[PDB]
Amino acid sequence: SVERIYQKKTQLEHILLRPDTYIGSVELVTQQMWVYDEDVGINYREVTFVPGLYKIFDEILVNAADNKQRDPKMSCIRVTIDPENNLISIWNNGKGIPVVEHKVEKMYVPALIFGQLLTSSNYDDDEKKVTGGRNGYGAKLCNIFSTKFTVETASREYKKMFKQTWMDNMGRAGEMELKPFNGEDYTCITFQPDLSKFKMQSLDKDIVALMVRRAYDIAGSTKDVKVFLNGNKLPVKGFRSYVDMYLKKVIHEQVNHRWEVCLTMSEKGFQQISFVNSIATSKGGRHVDYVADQIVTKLVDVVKKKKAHQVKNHMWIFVNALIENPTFDSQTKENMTLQPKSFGSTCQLSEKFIKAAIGCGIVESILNWVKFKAQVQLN
Amino acid sequence: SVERIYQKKTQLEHILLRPDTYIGSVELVTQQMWVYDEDVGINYREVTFVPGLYKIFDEILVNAADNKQRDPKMSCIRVTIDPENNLISIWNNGKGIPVVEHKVEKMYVPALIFGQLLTSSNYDDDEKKVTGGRNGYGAKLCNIFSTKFTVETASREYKKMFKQTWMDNMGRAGEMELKPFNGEDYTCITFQPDLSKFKMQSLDKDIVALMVRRAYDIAGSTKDVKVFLNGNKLPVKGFRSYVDMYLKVIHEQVNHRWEVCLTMSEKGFQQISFVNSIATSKGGRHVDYVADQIVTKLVHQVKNHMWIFVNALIENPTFDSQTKENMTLQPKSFGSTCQLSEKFIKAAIGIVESILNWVKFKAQVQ
Ligand SMILES: Nc1ncnc2c1ncn2[C@@H]1O[C@H](COP(=O)(O)OP(=O)(O)O)[C@@H](O)[C@H]1O
Ligand SMILES: Nc1ncnc2c1ncn2[C@@H]1O[C@H](COP(=O)(O)OP(=O)(O)O)[C@@H](O)[C@H]1O
Ligand SMILES: [Mg+2]
Ligand SMILES: [Mg+2]
């Protein structure tokens, strides 16, 4: 009775019992957002989907992009989505995971970091890294919310390939397969999400449209990384070309190795599209405020010569950023809360960018509008 | 090298290493919100505070309120805030925690549920409870982020009193003290928050003003519970009187689980709400459920004239984040409904100002 009332849970039990604490809502939500629809392409519409499901997909995708930082020679990511077989796989090149036994934990590294909770190569903050990874949960969460989860990685350096399958919400695992290897390194994560945990029958149009858009995001946000979807190379060559998809006048600057900015006029209020370490910061954050307010200030002062949030409300801004040890207001990670002083870099836009921005069709809209309101009489 | 690169953490290490995942930001934020200032009382202003520090306080306060559901005879909560001694204590009456050894976990229950992670009496969802407690973290998180954390609880039923102190971020514990007991049951949690973890020198005005407001919220959101702050009874007798403090209005206690107040807003849509005594500052489906019901009867422009206050008891509530400012459970799974009476609805009809739309018989001319 005392023993029935007061309980202790294992870590694994707890995640399944309280999923929203780890992956966010396991219920449907409906909201407006950009997705990539088949035949139509990038568009803004109402979408109904489960955040938790999006999240576990996003964890594996971001992990692939994280590997770019670990190994700049990485050049490709391949994504496969198969609704009929309820099957998703995410492949990447560049250095594989060390296929070797961990001397402290007494298991092979891949099995450790995909099969045991609280495991990461990003737990040392002294190293100052710009990965999306930070907590050591992501890959495990995908595993816990999958009926089958397969890890395959190949390490030339250790001359071996590792392959292992987990099943039933990481409740059991198949035998670990090792083989000799000396090819080019790859990692492939293949999983079948547990749709009953998300109250879904299949990977419907909406969730797929989101997942597909993330592939495009990765193509846009990473450097010198080709992205394939299913089989086809995505026609996105860097951030500029990514931004072009959203448009049918645009100002651009690659400020430095960690910041890239595009700006155009908005007629629907302040808009932002942004990324931090290849994470989609859909609700913005201090990184967007940092760049935007810098532009706002300069444009307000030009307007003063002949109003602040009003200037900002005419802006559509696109930001790709690499931030050290980023922080977010929730799981979901839609809003990045780290202060600019801790970013690890600055982003001072060039005078050329600012000058082009003063043109751009913007200070003009505001001035015409303000001249107009002076002409209006209410009768 | 492999072993230095790829690391595994204990649960405890992880919480201290990645606190914001468990308690929210351990950095200052600045935002506008309602607080209770000394001499001035309830007011809306800019506030600078650390959310994580607010949370650990909140966890212990909500736990005290949760005990009401466990024991309806509970009548009192006493809160003590002492900035100088960096000392907070939260006392409640009603049934104490069973002072007895847990047969499976092989320790006394109070030590188990305040000293071990992932421990709760709210893990059975068949029981359909309306507590704020759900995850079995809260009390531990307060302990983990305190230099000293003391649990004292007294159970007539088991004829014993338990007392134990943890120290250094739950890194060590003192000896457990047991004594015979036959008085009236109480539980008192007394802690000193680890201010260095929150980069603070003391419990300043702002955080104290937040904490004090929560005391008032509890007085407002719980039923037949007197609340004391530093020895003074708070003058809040139920939700209506709580709402009045904001307004120096139409009301309905719809049922045992829903209470609603509505007035006009001139500042856009405003909401003040609670789910199981948790402060849902950013709202949720519970506020949408009540509000949209009102809106529909009179029709976003309507909604933007509303200032609504909602106190709800929800079964197994769910939230965006760890700050629990936004409650996400869908109305089908609430465990109750909240159909406002025709009287309320009628009193609500005295916002309707077709007056602005009418007067929008304007002519823009040059
Ligand atoms: N595609 C990949 N390539 C190389 N390493 C990977 C890949 N995916 C995951 N990892 C490694 O395994 C860990 C995955 O853990 P994850 O749970 O995603 O934690 P993190 O918060 O570190 O990203 C990482 O720390 C990383 O070292
Ligand atoms: N004031 C109290 N009176 C009685 N029991 C308490 C009190 N505070 C905490 N508890 C018990 O200890 C547990 C506290 O754990 P907590 O960490 O707050 O998780 P949760 O509240 O989610 O159950 C509760 O489940 C409850 O059984
Ligand atoms: Mg990761
Ligand atoms: Mg609690």
Author numbering:
A (entry chain B): 29 to 276, 287 to 344, 352 to 424
B (entry chain A): 29 to 276, 288 to 338, 354 to 404, 407 to 422
What does the paper say about this structure?
Type II DNA topoisomerases are essential enzymes that catalyze topological rearrangement of double-stranded DNA (dsDNA) to maintain chromosomes in an appropriate state. In particular, DNA gyrase introduces negative supercoils into covalently closed dsDNA molecules using the free energy generated by ATP hydrolysis. The GyrB subunit is comprised of three domains: the N-terminal ATPase domain (GHKL family), the transducer domain, and the C-terminal TOPRIM domain. Here we report the structures of bacterial GyrB43 in complex with (i) the pre-hydrolysis analog ADP⋅BeF3, (ii) the post-hydrolysis ADP⋅Pi and (iii) the product ADP.
Structures of type II topoisomerases have been determined previously for archael topoVI-B' in complex with various nucleotides and for human topoII (htopoII) in complex with AMPPNP and ADP, highlighting some of the structural changes occurring along the ATP hydrolysis pathway. In contrast, human topoisomerase II shows a semi-open ADP complex characterized by an 8° outward rotation of the transducer domain when compared with its restrained/closed AMPPNP conformation. Thus, the structure apparently represents an ADP⋅SO4 mimic of the post-hydrolysis state and the domain rotation may well be of functional relevance (see also below). Interestingly, also human topoII may undergo a similar structural transition as inferred by the comparison of the respective AMPPNP and ADP⋅SO4 complexes. As for bacterial gyrase, the pivot of the motion is at the center of the interface between the C-terminal ATPase domain helix and the transducer β-sheet, but the direction of the rotation axis is different.
